[PDB]
Amino acid sequence: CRPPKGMYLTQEDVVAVSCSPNAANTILRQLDMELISLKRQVQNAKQVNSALKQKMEGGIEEFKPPESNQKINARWTTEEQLLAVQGVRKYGKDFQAIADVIGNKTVGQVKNFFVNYRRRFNLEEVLQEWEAE
Amino acid sequence: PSGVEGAAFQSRLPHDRMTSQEAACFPDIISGPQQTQKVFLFIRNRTLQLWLDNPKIQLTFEATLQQLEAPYNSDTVLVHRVHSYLERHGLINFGIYKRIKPLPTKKTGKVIIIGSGVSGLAAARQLQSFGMDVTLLEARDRVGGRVATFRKGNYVADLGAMVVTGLGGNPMAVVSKQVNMELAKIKQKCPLYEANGQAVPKEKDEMVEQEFNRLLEATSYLSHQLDFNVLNNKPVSLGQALEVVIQLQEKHVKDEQIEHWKKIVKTQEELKELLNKMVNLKEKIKELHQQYKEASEVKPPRDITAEFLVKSKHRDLTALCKEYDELAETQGKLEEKLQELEANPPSDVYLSSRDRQILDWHFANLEFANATPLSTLSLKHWDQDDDFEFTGSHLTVRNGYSCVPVALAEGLDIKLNTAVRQVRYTASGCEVIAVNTRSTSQTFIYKCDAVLCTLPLGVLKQQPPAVQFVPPLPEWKTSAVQRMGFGNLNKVVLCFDRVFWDPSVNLFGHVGSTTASRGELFLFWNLYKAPILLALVAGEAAGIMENISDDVIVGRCLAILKGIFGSSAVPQPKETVVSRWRADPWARGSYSYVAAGSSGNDYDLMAQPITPGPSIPGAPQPIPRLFFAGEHTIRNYPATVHGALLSGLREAGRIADQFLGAMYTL
Ligand SMILES: Cc1cc2nc3c(=O)[nH]c(=O)nc-3n(C[C@H](O)[C@H](O)[C@H](O)COP(=O)(O)OP(=O)(O)OC[C@H]3O[C@@H](n4cnc5c(N)ncnc54)[C@H](O)[C@@H]3O)c2cc1C
């Protein structure tokens, strides 16, 4: 009913190999050429990838800034407000980043701040500015 | 099976159904109601049984009816009809039996039989048994034909037929009871031993073998499922189909490796692009660090935009460092997934060489069993006679198979050294012209009502003809003779003074160096009491080796065997014989095979008798005059002894029906 398991034979493949006396060799050579042509091609990209691995030597540890683990505190000092306004100019509504900058403010009190002072600091104008970039 | 069904089976008949042969003789019954059929069958099977239970004494109608019980012996014509049909068609009282009713004083009809083969002898016994007057004409100086059995001293070895391919349904079973053949089972275990001399290990042996068998079922799939049976207006051979399959099997191996490396490169391309992305992050990060440095080096107290500048760059930097750590994690994965792949590659190859040569032996064994190159077997039909294979272990005749023709020969008018040159068959009877093989100026003429021809297919195929038919055989016949295949295979007999081989092993194989020579000496049998080794040449080899001196051939054997068992252990042989069947002019080959382009049909065409046209024109249609038997005439049991033996039984039946008429049909 079906070819024994792991034997492979199709109408197309049988027709394919039979067409000509040599079609057999032909077909099997292309597969042999096409193999070496990928084996070499792997050889390259190995070296090539190994080149760029030499360029990443050391890693980025020597560039890791010192960490600041200062606790949240929801009391807005005037400079914290100022840092914020500037963040908006630099980040748009990325309130996560902005809070990262301010350092001791979660991501909400930032949205809060956004909508509390949005009139007095023209945070709409500050956004329109960030936007045009 | 047991009892009466046992007999139906042991007589190659379905116990629960009437055969076409039976339908033809008992049309009343088979058109009749079920009940009578069951009676008829029982009566048949029962009678068979009785014969089978004791084939050393003629089974008489009396003895038969005697032993039937009612309801069945109520119809005593049916019993006779049946008993008589079985006797005719040699399903009972065939072979060598003690005749209860000494032979009819006076004989009816005259038949000349060509060839003292088994087919010939079995026919001739029957016809004689049926009262006819029979003479056999044989070219050789002995009976048996392709049952040849070398004998010198205690050495005894068959150069033709030596196996009894199973007793389940084999007429030779019966004959073995009537004649002492010393049947010894053959232990199928055959260890192979590469070109060099080194046993093949279990692991290979089985891997390869199973591939062989797999490859065959494959071919079948092409044939039946994909209809791969013609190619460029020529019929596909088993060989072609095997190559094609092997090809495709290789093609797949490659096709898989390809798509494996295609996965490697594609994963490298993932890794590459990530490395650029990572090396440029390296860059931005390195620099962005600087700016943070610089901004942070400005000292407090600072105004807020400068304070912002530090903090801004700090986060912007920690952010990027995070991104890099992540990608270094991703990198670690692609790097290790890259190591899984070049660690776990698909199959390098389909078959090494060392295997593909072992596989070549599994092919020689097939070429040996079919007496022919697989380039020549019909893809569609080479194995049509498969369903009819017997049951039981295969066996050998340990005192030599010639014991059988010789037994059969006993009591027959056989003329040896008589070579038929011409067969003339006319509306009014036939004459056969023969010569003395010894001095061929001497001529004989034999007149007879009928001729039964057991001439080998090789001999029939011969050009120019060894035997002339007058008139010529009709084209329908002569085409079947071309279309059919008549193969070849030879044996070399090595008689030694001591056993230097394993006595618990009957046969063992040698693996040839090349495909083109997987035939040569590829198998050795150790089957006889005396220290004899027998070596087969199969395949394309048998053909070529026929053109090589014996000494050389025997050399090549000792070589092979020295390589297997060591130079100190391989004496010279005391005695050697070497067959050359294709050369042998009374055989011109070894046995039939289903050529590509032929069908089992041709075998039937071979058995159809020939009916000469009328003497005077306008005179009415004659009787059939020229009849054919032999191993090539019997579709379901070709190329065997039993199958010849049966063909002989068949034609005797048919000839007697013709010339003595058949009372049992009413
Ligand atoms: C090497 C070999 C091994 C075999 N092994 C086996 C086996 O293991 N098992 C098995 O079951 N079968 C086997 N066979 C097949 C078997 O031997 C034959 O099928 C069988 O013996 C056929 O008998 P036959 O009467 O049809 O033909 P034959 O036995 O050939 O008889 C025909 C007769 O015709 C005679 N003759 C030819 N030309 C003329 C003429 N012009 N005038 C008068 N007489 C003529 C011949 O001399 C011969 O005696 C084997 C055959 C060979 C060659």
Side-chain angles (χ1 to χ4, degrees):
Chain A
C1 172
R2 315 146 292 253
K5 248 46 175 182
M7 220 79 98
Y8 297 80
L9 328 99
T10 331
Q11 191 49 222
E12 72 166 13
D13 282 318
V14 178
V15 177
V17 170
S18 42
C19 295
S20 144
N22 272 112
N25 255 219
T26 289
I27 296 263
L28 304 188
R29 274 206 179 81
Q30 268 70 113
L31 288 324
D32 274 335
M33 293 327 163
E34 224 227 325
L35 194 79
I36 50 186
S37 141
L38 295 108
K39 277 169 156 215
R40 88 161 81 265
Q41 187 178 134
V42 152
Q43 198 65 293
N44 271 207
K46 266 196 64 188
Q47 279 165 38
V48 151
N49 280 43
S50 134
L52 328 192
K53 267 171 69 217
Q54 201 162 31
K55 293 200 186 137
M56 303 181 318
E57 230 86 283
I60 61 155
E61 31 276 51
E62 71 177 327
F63 308 141
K64 260 174 224 133
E67 301 169 34
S68 60
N69 322 324
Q70 51 148 4
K71 281 296 187 175
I72 302 303
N73 171 330
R75 204 127 311 268
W76 287 95
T77 48
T78 320
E79 89 299 30
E80 283 163 342
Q81 302 172 55
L82 277 153
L83 286 153
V85 169
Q86 290 186 76
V88 169
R89 183 58 186 74
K90 195 195 161 67
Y91 293 127
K93 282 198 310 186
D94 189 343
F95 306 114
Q96 178 38 36
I98 293 194
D100 290 316
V101 162
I102 316 233
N104 70 20
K105 289 209 182 346
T106 23
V107 197
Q109 15 33 244
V110 166
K111 299 205 208 170
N112 277 245
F113 168 86
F114 192 119
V115 207
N116 294 273
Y117 300 94
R118 116 209 149 66
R119 59 259 197 70
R120 277 171 298 174
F121 291 167
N122 319 56
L123 306 201
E124 79 297 333
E125 272 168 324
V126 181
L127 246 169
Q128 296 170 257
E129 291 282 351
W130 174 83
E131 258 146 29
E133 295 198 351
Chain B
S2 89
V4 308
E5 297 160 32
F9 160 85
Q10 169 64 38
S11 298
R12 310 160 294 284
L13 303 150
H15 66 77
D16 55 48
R17 188 182 67 235
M18 295 175 79
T19 77
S20 197
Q21 162 96 313
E22 288 168 336
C25 300
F26 297 81
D28 52 281
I29 298 198
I30 198 172
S31 49
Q34 278 291 335
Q35 189 45 44
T36 45
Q37 296 176 18
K38 303 204 203 182
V39 193
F40 158 75
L41 292 164
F42 180 98
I43 308 180
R44 176 241 273 158
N45 317 19
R46 186 45 188 151
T47 314
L48 279 156
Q49 173 156 31
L50 283 88
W51 161 247
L52 284 168
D53 295 357
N54 188 2
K56 270 226 252 42
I57 47 170
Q58 168 169 4
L59 180 68
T60 49
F61 168 53
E62 287 65 41
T64 303
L65 185 37
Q66 158 57 39
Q67 226 107 188
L68 277 160
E69 272 191 336
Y72 308 122
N73 55 5
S74 106
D75 200 340
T76 101
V77 281
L78 195 62
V79 172
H80 189 79
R81 278 178 90 194
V82 164
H83 176 278
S84 284
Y85 153 102
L86 299 184
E87 186 161 41
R88 196 43 94 68
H89 298 149
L91 285 174
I92 63 178
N93 307 297
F94 68 83
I96 293 133
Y97 38 106
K98 217 303 91 84
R99 167 151 289 261
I100 277 183
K101 311 192 168 181
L103 269 161
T105 177
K106 221 137 210 152
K107 317 186 147 297
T108 310
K110 161 66 170 195
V111 183
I112 272 302
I113 290 193
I114 305 181
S116 182
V118 162
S119 86
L121 299 152
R125 287 223 137 212
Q126 289 293 96
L127 292 172
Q128 166 157 112
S129 147
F130 294 168
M132 305 195 74
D133 158 324
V134 211
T135 281
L136 296 100
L137 306 183
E138 167 67 80
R140 293 201 214 264
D141 55 14
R142 44 153 203 110
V143 301
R146 293 164 256 185
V147 171
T149 300
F150 172 77
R151 280 159 213 282
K152 218 201 242 178
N154 296 289
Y155 302 148
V156 163
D158 274 282
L159 305 159
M162 88 209 142
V163 177
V164 176
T165 92
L167 306 189
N170 182 330
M172 308 298 323
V174 160
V175 180
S176 78
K177 291 169 131 169
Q178 313 171 329
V179 203
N180 173 30
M181 319 135 90
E182 297 166 47
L183 294 196
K185 303 190 203 184
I186 281 163
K187 312 184 225 175
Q188 288 312 307
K189 194 204 150 201
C190 190
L192 317 183
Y193 291 56
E194 273 150 290
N196 77 55
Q198 289 298 280
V200 169
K202 271 254 293 276
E203 262 229 322
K204 276 262 136 193
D205 213 3
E206 302 189 16
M207 278 191 251
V208 189
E209 172 143 336
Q210 204 194 158
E211 203 47 41
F212 176 46
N213 306 304
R214 282 167 53 70
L215 281 158
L216 280 166
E217 305 162 56
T219 39
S220 183
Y221 180 92
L222 275 71
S223 176
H224 301 128
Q225 308 289 177
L226 302 177
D227 205 298
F228 185 58
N229 293 302
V230 175
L231 195 51
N232 307 172
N233 303 308
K234 325 197 289 167
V236 177
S237 66
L238 185 56
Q240 287 179 210
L242 280 174
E243 258 155 2
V244 164
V245 161
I246 289 186
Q247 266 137 63
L248 270 30
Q249 260 21 238
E250 279 155 1
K251 174 171 163 296
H252 170 87
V253 152
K254 300 187 187 328
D255 274 22
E256 281 268 291
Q257 289 203 282
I258 282 167
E259 84 153 25
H260 182 240
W261 295 78
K262 289 180 65 151
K263 242 220 187 312
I264 284 181
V265 298
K266 197 219 210 191
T267 292
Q268 298 203 309
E269 256 29 30
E270 292 202 42
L271 185 70
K272 164 162 178 223
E273 273 166 42
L274 177 97
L275 299 198
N276 286 11
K277 181 198 176 75
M278 292 225 316
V279 106
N280 290 18
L281 197 66
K282 184 68 180 295
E283 259 35 279
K284 260 209 223 186
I285 281 186
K286 174 182 304 188
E287 146 185 359
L288 210 256
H289 178 69
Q290 196 42 44
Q291 292 148 56
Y292 166 72
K293 218 58 190 182
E294 301 177 2
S296 189
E297 319 230 297
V298 165
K299 307 275 58 166
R302 28 205 180 212
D303 75 355
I304 203 56
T305 67
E307 191 66 41
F308 174 70
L309 194 108
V310 181
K311 312 286 203 48
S312 138
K313 301 281 179 205
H314 184 275
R315 155 257 134 57
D316 289 6
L317 183 57
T318 64
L320 292 242
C321 293
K322 175 197 202 75
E323 289 191 28
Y324 183 95
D325 296 329
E326 289 180 356
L327 278 44
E329 220 166 40
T330 288
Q331 172 198 5
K333 299 193 175 180
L334 303 181
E335 269 192 320
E336 83 181 11
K337 153 165 192 170
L338 231 280
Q339 252 173 30
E340 158 161 346
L341 289 237
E342 16 74 337
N344 287 16
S347 249
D348 177 1
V349 303
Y350 175 45
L351 288 148
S352 76
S353 284
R354 230 172 131 277
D355 23 21
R356 158 88 264 242
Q357 304 170 316
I358 288 170
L359 186 61
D360 271 343
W361 183 104
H362 293 310
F363 294 128
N365 205 225
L366 207 64
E367 323 218 272
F368 148 86
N370 290 238
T372 195
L374 324 195
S375 40
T376 71
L377 298 175
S378 190
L379 170 60
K380 214 187 326 184
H381 296 297
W382 70 282
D383 61 338
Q384 60 104 53
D385 68 319
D386 220 304
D387 289 330
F388 305 99
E389 73 184 317
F390 297 147
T391 81
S393 343
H394 291 200
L395 287 75
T396 66
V397 185
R398 210 134 180 285
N399 51 321
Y401 216 158
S402 77
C403 76
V404 168
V406 169
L408 293 191
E410 201 221 37
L412 293 210
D413 189 32
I414 307 185
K415 310 249 162 292
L416 291 159
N417 310 285
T418 334
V420 164
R421 305 273 234 223
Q422 186 165 104
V423 167
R424 310 190 130 245
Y425 54 98
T426 53
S428 94
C430 330
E431 52 189 321
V432 186
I433 300 110
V435 304
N436 185 31
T437 22
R438 299 162 298 181
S439 78
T440 73
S441 233
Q442 262 173 257
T443 296
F444 305 69
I445 305 283
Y446 290 93
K447 303 230 158 68
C448 58
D449 310 297
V451 180
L452 179 56
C453 165
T454 95
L455 297 177
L457 176 53
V459 180
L460 291 181
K461 291 176 156 284
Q462 180 176 333
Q463 230 64 201
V467 161
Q468 227 203 301
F469 286 105
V470 163
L473 302 183
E475 97 93 59
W476 59 264
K477 172 75 87 192
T478 53
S479 311
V481 181
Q482 268 159 49
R483 287 195 314 263
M484 285 180 70
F486 193 56
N488 187 15
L489 98 69
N490 278 303
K491 289 180 190 194
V492 186
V493 162
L494 301 162
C495 301
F496 290 127
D497 36 320
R498 63 278 231 148
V499 172
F500 66 75
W501 40 87
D502 187 356
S504 40
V505 89
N506 287 139
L507 50 146
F508 67 82
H510 149 273
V511 181
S513 283
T514 5
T515 286
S517 54
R518 36 150 192 247
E520 322 203 0
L521 301 140
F522 89 109
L523 173 51
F524 293 69
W525 308 81
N526 152 39
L527 299 158
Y528 298 110
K529 323 209 180 100
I532 288 157
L533 271 198
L534 227 131
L536 285 36
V537 186
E540 290 284 19
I544 317 212
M545 288 279 289
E546 276 206 10
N547 268 68
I548 277 171
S549 106
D550 282 350
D551 287 322
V552 172
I553 292 166
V554 189
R556 312 208 184 174
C557 295
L558 295 174
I560 312 298
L561 295 156
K562 283 178 185 332
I564 304 278
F565 293 99
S567 304
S568 77
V570 172
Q572 287 313 92
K574 295 254 84 80
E575 301 293 310
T576 58
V577 207
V578 182
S579 81
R580 307 179 151 64
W581 283 108
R582 176 80 67 222
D584 177 14
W586 315 135
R588 280 258 180 293
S590 104
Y591 48 80
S592 69
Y593 72 78
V594 193
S598 179
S599 26
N601 228 272
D602 281 350
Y603 285 78
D604 281 350
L605 294 154
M606 291 312 303
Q608 242 62 276
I610 304 294
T611 300
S615 267
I616 326 96
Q621 184 127 312
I623 305 95
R625 288 296 189 194
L626 180 53
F627 294 82
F628 290 101
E631 150 271 314
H632 54 282
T633 59
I634 185 168
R635 187 172 180 139
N636 300 8
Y637 313 72
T640 74
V641 151
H642 57 260
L645 180 292
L646 301 186
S647 64
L649 292 203
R650 178 191 77 230
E651 286 303 78
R654 136 150 55 198
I655 271 152
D657 291 350
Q658 184 83 270
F659 284 91
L660 313 193
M663 315 317 185
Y664 62 80
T665 324
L666 294 64

PDB file of all heavy atoms in Angstrom, chain B residues 321-332:
ATOM      1  N   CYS B 321      23.117  49.117  28.219  1.00  0.00           N
ATOM      2  CA  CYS B 321      23.822  47.988  28.786  1.00  0.00           C
ATOM      3  C   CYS B 321      22.894  46.790  28.968  1.00  0.00           C
ATOM      4  O   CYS B 321      23.234  45.686  28.531  1.00  0.00           O
ATOM      5  CB  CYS B 321      24.479  48.388  30.095  1.00  0.00           C
ATOM      6  SG  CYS B 321      25.772  49.574  29.730  1.00  0.00           S
ATOM      7  N   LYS B 322      21.733  47.010  29.594  1.00  0.00           N
ATOM      8  CA  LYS B 322      20.644  46.028  29.594  1.00  0.00           C
ATOM      9  C   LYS B 322      20.452  45.394  28.184  1.00  0.00           C
ATOM     10  O   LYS B 322      20.713  44.204  28.014  1.00  0.00           O
ATOM     11  CB  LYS B 322      19.368  46.691  30.098  1.00  0.00           C
ATOM     12  CG  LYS B 322      18.106  45.855  30.055  1.00  0.00           C
ATOM     13  CD  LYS B 322      16.879  46.760  30.169  1.00  0.00           C
ATOM     14  CE  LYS B 322      15.645  46.015  30.654  1.00  0.00           C
ATOM     15  NZ  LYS B 322      15.731  45.739  32.116  1.00  0.00           N
ATOM     16  N   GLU B 323      20.054  46.168  27.175  1.00  0.00           N
ATOM     17  CA  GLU B 323      19.963  45.632  25.804  1.00  0.00           C
ATOM     18  C   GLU B 323      21.099  44.722  25.392  1.00  0.00           C
ATOM     19  O   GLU B 323      20.873  43.778  24.664  1.00  0.00           O
ATOM     20  CB  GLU B 323      19.934  46.725  24.743  1.00  0.00           C
ATOM     21  CG  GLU B 323      18.651  47.525  24.677  1.00  0.00           C
ATOM     22  CD  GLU B 323      18.603  48.411  23.440  1.00  0.00           C
ATOM     23  OE1 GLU B 323      19.240  48.052  22.412  1.00  0.00           O
ATOM     24  OE2 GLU B 323      17.926  49.470  23.502  1.00  0.00           O
ATOM     25  N   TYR B 324      22.321  45.027  25.795  1.00  0.00           N
ATOM     26  CA  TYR B 324      23.461  44.210  25.402  1.00  0.00           C
ATOM     27  C   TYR B 324      23.484  42.887  26.143  1.00  0.00           C
ATOM     28  O   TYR B 324      23.677  41.848  25.537  1.00  0.00           O
ATOM     29  CB  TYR B 324      24.761  44.943  25.659  1.00  0.00           C
ATOM     30  CG  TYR B 324      26.012  44.207  25.229  1.00  0.00           C
ATOM     31  CD1 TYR B 324      26.598  44.451  23.980  1.00  0.00           C
ATOM     32  CD2 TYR B 324      26.641  43.294  26.097  1.00  0.00           C
ATOM     33  CE1 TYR B 324      27.771  43.797  23.593  1.00  0.00           C
ATOM     34  CE2 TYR B 324      27.821  42.637  25.733  1.00  0.00           C
ATOM     35  CZ  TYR B 324      28.383  42.884  24.466  1.00  0.00           C
ATOM     36  OH  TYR B 324      29.561  42.234  24.089  1.00  0.00           O
ATOM     37  N   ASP B 325      23.304  42.922  27.454  1.00  0.00           N
ATOM     38  CA  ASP B 325      23.222  41.691  28.243  1.00  0.00           C
ATOM     39  C   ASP B 325      22.217  40.696  27.666  1.00  0.00           C
ATOM     40  O   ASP B 325      22.492  39.494  27.602  1.00  0.00           O
ATOM     41  CB  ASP B 325      22.809  42.021  29.671  1.00  0.00           C
ATOM     42  CG  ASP B 325      23.830  42.862  30.380  1.00  0.00           C
ATOM     43  OD1 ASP B 325      25.043  42.729  30.073  1.00  0.00           O
ATOM     44  OD2 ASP B 325      23.408  43.657  31.237  1.00  0.00           O
ATOM     45  N   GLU B 326      21.056  41.213  27.263  1.00  0.00           N
ATOM     46  CA  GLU B 326      19.994  40.413  26.660  1.00  0.00           C
ATOM     47  C   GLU B 326      20.474  39.715  25.406  1.00  0.00           C
ATOM     48  O   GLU B 326      20.321  38.499  25.254  1.00  0.00           O
ATOM     49  CB  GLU B 326      18.788  41.285  26.338  1.00  0.00           C
ATOM     50  CG  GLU B 326      18.057  41.718  27.603  1.00  0.00           C
ATOM     51  CD  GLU B 326      16.846  42.589  27.322  1.00  0.00           C
ATOM     52  OE1 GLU B 326      16.624  42.908  26.132  1.00  0.00           O
ATOM     53  OE2 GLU B 326      16.126  42.953  28.288  1.00  0.00           O
ATOM     54  N   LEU B 327      21.081  40.487  24.518  1.00  0.00           N
ATOM     55  CA  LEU B 327      21.595  39.945  23.277  1.00  0.00           C
ATOM     56  C   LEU B 327      22.722  38.960  23.505  1.00  0.00           C
ATOM     57  O   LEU B 327      22.893  38.048  22.730  1.00  0.00           O
ATOM     58  CB  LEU B 327      22.048  41.059  22.347  1.00  0.00           C
ATOM     59  CG  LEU B 327      20.940  41.732  21.525  1.00  0.00           C
ATOM     60  CD1 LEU B 327      19.646  42.080  22.294  1.00  0.00           C
ATOM     61  CD2 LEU B 327      21.562  42.958  20.862  1.00  0.00           C
ATOM     62  N   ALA B 328      23.495  39.128  24.561  1.00  0.00           N
ATOM     63  CA  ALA B 328      24.532  38.154  24.884  1.00  0.00           C
ATOM     64  C   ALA B 328      23.913  36.848  25.382  1.00  0.00           C
ATOM     65  O   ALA B 328      24.534  35.786  25.287  1.00  0.00           O
ATOM     66  CB  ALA B 328      25.476  38.717  25.933  1.00  0.00           C
ATOM     67  N   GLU B 329      22.703  36.932  25.934  1.00  0.00           N
ATOM     68  CA  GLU B 329      21.956  35.738  26.332  1.00  0.00           C
ATOM     69  C   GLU B 329      21.433  35.035  25.079  1.00  0.00           C
ATOM     70  O   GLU B 329      21.777  33.884  24.837  1.00  0.00           O
ATOM     71  CB  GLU B 329      20.812  36.095  27.277  1.00  0.00           C
ATOM     72  CG  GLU B 329      20.614  35.100  28.405  1.00  0.00           C
ATOM     73  CD  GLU B 329      19.719  35.659  29.496  1.00  0.00           C
ATOM     74  OE1 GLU B 329      18.717  36.334  29.164  1.00  0.00           O
ATOM     75  OE2 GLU B 329      20.024  35.439  30.687  1.00  0.00           O
ATOM     76  N   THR B 330      20.632  35.736  24.279  1.00  0.00           N
ATOM     77  CA  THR B 330      20.288  35.270  22.940  1.00  0.00           C
ATOM     78  C   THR B 330      21.461  34.681  22.167  1.00  0.00           C
ATOM     79  O   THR B 330      21.321  33.661  21.522  1.00  0.00           O
ATOM     80  CB  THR B 330      19.747  36.417  22.078  1.00  0.00           C
ATOM     81  OG1 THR B 330      18.430  36.773  22.525  1.00  0.00           O
ATOM     82  CG2 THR B 330      19.730  36.044  20.564  1.00  0.00           C
ATOM     83  N   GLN B 331      22.602  35.340  22.178  1.00  0.00           N
ATOM     84  CA  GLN B 331      23.768  34.819  21.479  1.00  0.00           C
ATOM     85  C   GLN B 331      24.159  33.446  22.009  1.00  0.00           C
ATOM     86  O   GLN B 331      24.453  32.544  21.230  1.00  0.00           O
ATOM     87  CB  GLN B 331      24.959  35.752  21.654  1.00  0.00           C
ATOM     88  CG  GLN B 331      26.269  35.191  21.124  1.00  0.00           C
ATOM     89  CD  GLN B 331      27.475  35.906  21.684  1.00  0.00           C
ATOM     90  OE1 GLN B 331      27.354  36.773  22.553  1.00  0.00           O
ATOM     91  NE2 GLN B 331      28.656  35.539  21.195  1.00  0.00           N
ATOM     92  N   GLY B 332      24.189  33.301  23.331  1.00  0.00           N
ATOM     93  CA  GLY B 332      24.557  32.032  23.959  1.00  0.00           C
ATOM     94  C   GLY B 332      23.696  30.876  23.485  1.00  0.00           C
ATOM     95  O   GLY B 332      24.190  29.759  23.348  1.00  0.00           O
TER      96      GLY B 332
END
